[PDB]
Amino acid sequence: TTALVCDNGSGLVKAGFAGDDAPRAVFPSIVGRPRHQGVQKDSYVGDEAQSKRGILTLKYPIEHGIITNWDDMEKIWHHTFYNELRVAPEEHPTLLTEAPLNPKANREKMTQIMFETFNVPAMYVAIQAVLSLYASGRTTGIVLDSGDGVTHNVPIYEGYALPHAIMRLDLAGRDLTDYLMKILTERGYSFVTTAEREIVRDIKEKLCYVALDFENEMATAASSSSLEKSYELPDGQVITIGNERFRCPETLFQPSFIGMESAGIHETTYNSIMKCDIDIRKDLYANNVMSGGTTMYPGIADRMQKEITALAPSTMKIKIIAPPERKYSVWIGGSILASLSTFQQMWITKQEYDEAGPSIVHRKCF
Amino acid sequence: KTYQSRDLVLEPIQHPKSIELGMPEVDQSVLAEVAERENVIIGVRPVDEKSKSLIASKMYSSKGLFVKAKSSDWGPMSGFIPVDQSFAKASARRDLEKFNEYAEQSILSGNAVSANLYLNQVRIEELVSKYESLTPLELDVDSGMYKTTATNGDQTIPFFLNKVTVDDKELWQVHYLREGELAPFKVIGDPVSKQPMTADYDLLTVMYTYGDLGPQSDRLKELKDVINTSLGRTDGLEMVHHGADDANPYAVMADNFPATFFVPKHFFDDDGLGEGKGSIQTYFNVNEQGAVVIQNPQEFSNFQQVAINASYRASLNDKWNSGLDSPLFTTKRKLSHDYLDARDEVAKKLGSPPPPPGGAGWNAYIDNLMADGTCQDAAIVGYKDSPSVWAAVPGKTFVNITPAEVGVLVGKDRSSFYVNGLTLGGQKCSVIRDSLLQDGEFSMDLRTKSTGGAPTFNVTVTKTDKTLVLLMGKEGVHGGLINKKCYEMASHLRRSQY
Ligand SMILES: Nc1ncnc2c1ncn2[C@@H]1O[C@H](COP(=O)(O)OP(=O)(O)O)[C@@H](O)[C@H]1O
Ligand SMILES: [Mg+2]
């Protein structure tokens, strides 16, 4: 029997089989239900829901990393098992991922749904950042996970996330796409609709980068066309992307760009390290692992190296690891974990659930 | 230097030999530049060697979708798809009704036209002198055409070639005897350009970097347009077509090998396959134009592993028939070495007291906790009044727990132990979870801290009305197992008013 691995992303579900080096299914965490409640299908999931948005009211049940609507979440899992993976959930142990700091009531509800709704023989809930650390071949370090709806700094000791030291930033890829749409619209273009958001997301993913020195890069952009890139829009017209290439991901280091009064990702990394035991801090500084789609920007590891170096004691050995596969490292780490012989000891069995109820997840999964 | 990553071993190519390919070298250079600009790996199926000049002429169209009629390998129609399939290769000649129907249905469905066949002077010289596929041309004064016969296929059929001018080019139109009368020979042509179809550049596979994999086939369509744009042929004469025909139940080495692969230029650097791992041209045959020549299934498997290890993968959204034979072609066989190595590293890194109920003997409780072999240490400690160890495993850590250490565990302050941990029997521990005040749990999960590579162990402490139940796992034992065991013992103690 093969274990299933389902990464419940704020923007995208990444799902597949343990032992594989990539997910089989990647789709939007979206559920659509008819806008009129009166008299083909009662609900739609992912790409199908987005295409029928004129007919449906769309909901994002994991918008900020934490599941808020269980009826919509059950539709997402049903779609994942039956439509994407084409499997009978009752035949497979299932590894689910969860956000850092996921409330106790939420992980209990996730456990109850897997056993009572899907009848899985066994399951486990792992924190997303921990799996990314495992995908980098490590068990101790600090992960910066920036996804679609949320970003976290998660320090981890021998496979165990340290919740007292986790930092959350309420900004990730979705906010960067919206900010890019706004600063391009400021030039006289118009990027406001759902179809225009997809164009801007493509511009962001293809042309954006993190500047090593923002103020110097802004001066270079205003003095020459050396940083300019041309992009062909769907209508055939051409738009020049200049300083927006690096102003867009600059928001990760300067959240005031979108009116947020939060510290930047380099400052939350430092803060999270300092909340951990003195004895582990050198190991965290030497093992900063980047993960998630919003860490894909070229230049981000070199910028983090410079920023963390400026903050830390000058003798501190600092290392930033940004794997090529970091867009899927949470899923890959789950595949690694669920394919190990040690995982058979970690899963929660249906027998354990029948004895203890949903609160068994507090004891077994951390 | 030999290349080695896990079970992948590549010996350096000693004295590389030139390999004949059908794709013109000018087009190999174009594809090498596309692979660099687009940061992709492109594989193209072999083009028949004899069709090189037809493609190089840039006069013809190329084989599109929905064309099941066969090409010919003889006569003046060699390299083309004749409308009359009696002029095609041996397999079509022995199945005339089937293949003639495919040719006519391709025209009727608008996927082809019947076109005249014009050959250039280069082609007449190749067929007569280079390949000796045709007998020397003999002028037939009554028609003004040159008669010739094939030296393979059906050698009894005369063909007639006529000097014609088509758009300022001096070409040779092919004619034959149709029902005994001279008629222009017809080949399957493209429905838009009306030009005869030669072999196309049939893509074997495309491997992308991660910054191109995922939901957002659009990407492949865009890449195919870049390829045709860079090849610079007249509109309608494209060598690459959108979409792909069925996988087909066929094999034959000449159909998939020798394949020409085009890769980003970083592969040709001295650190191409890693840091001090060498260049790709050291282990694979690469020509002057940057074409990586893949000659057999074992080489294809090795190249695919090298590409996957470099984080280039075939898309999920794309459909390919990449394999042919099976020297380790399954998904399990082609797992990335970064995945397998990380799994290996993680697997390695993961590893007077009151009378108890039911009579007397707190040692029995320790024996119960230690029975299943998961724990190396266990203890029951009274924490009210003057704290003391009621029972513990002799010669371990918990037996030495002090009242000061108990005070830290149960103390009002729940944050000073995050500065640098706490101790249990003098052993330094870090706090992983403090649920001491959480209803229904009343527990703390910790992990010891040690030096160098000495193993560390998970610990759970659960608080009852009068006791602390402590447990330490052996190396590799997950914290969840220890927490569950500690909880169950604490629940039993709480039921007996302890
Ligand atoms: N190459 C890239 N450059 C920048 N952002 C990217 C890139 N690839 C993906 N993203 C962004 O990453 C986000 C999705 O990342 P992901 O880790 O899957 O999120 P989640 O797990 O929260 O669903 C989206 O906002 C997407 O636009
Ligand atoms: Mg995520």
Residue numbers in the entry:
A (entry chain A): 5 to 43, 49 to 375
B (entry chain B): 466 to 681, 728 to 862, 895 to 1041
What did the publication describing this PDB structure actually write?
ExoY virulence factors are members of a family of bacterial nucleotidyl cyclases (NCs) that are activated by specific eukaryotic cofactors and overproduce cyclic purine and pyrimidine nucleotides in host cells. Here, we explore the Vibrio nigripulchritudo Multifunctional-Autoprocessing Repeats-in-ToXin (MARTX) ExoY effector domain (Vn-ExoY) as a model for ExoY-type members that interact with monomeric (G-actin) instead of filamentous (F-actin) actin. While Pa-ExoY requires actin filaments (F-actin) for maximal activation, Vn-ExoY is selectively activated by G-actin in vitro. The catalytic domain of NC toxins can be divided into subdomains CA and CB, with the catalytic site located in a groove at their interface.
To improve the crystallisation strategy, we designed a chimeric protein containing three fused functional domains: Vn-ExoY extended at the C-terminus (Vn-ExoY455-896, either wild-type or with K528M/K535I), a short profilin-binding proline-rich motif (PRM) and profilin (VnE/VnEDM-PRM-Prof). Using this chimera (wild-type or double-mutant), we solved two crystal structures at 1.7 Å resolution: (i) VnEDM-PRM-Prof bound to actin-ADP with latrunculin B (LatB), and (ii) VnE-PRM-Prof bound to actin-ADP without LatB. In these structures, profilin is bound to actin-ADP, the PRM to profilin, Vn-ExoY to actin, while residues 863–895 connecting the C-terminus of Vn-ExoY to the PRM are disordered. Vn-ExoY contacts actin-ADP via its switch A and C, but only switch C is fully ordered. The Vn-ExoY switch A disorder (residues 682–727) is close to the LatB-binding site in actin. However, solving the structure without LatB only slightly reduces the switch A disorder. In the latter structure, the NBP of Vn-ExoY is further stabilised by a sulphate ion (VnE-PRM-Prof-SO42-:actin-ADP). A SO42- ion is bound to the Vn-ExoY NBP via residues (K528VnE-CA, K535VnE-LID, S536VnE-LID, K554VnE-LID) that coordinate the γ- and β-phosphates of 3’dATP when this ligand is bound.
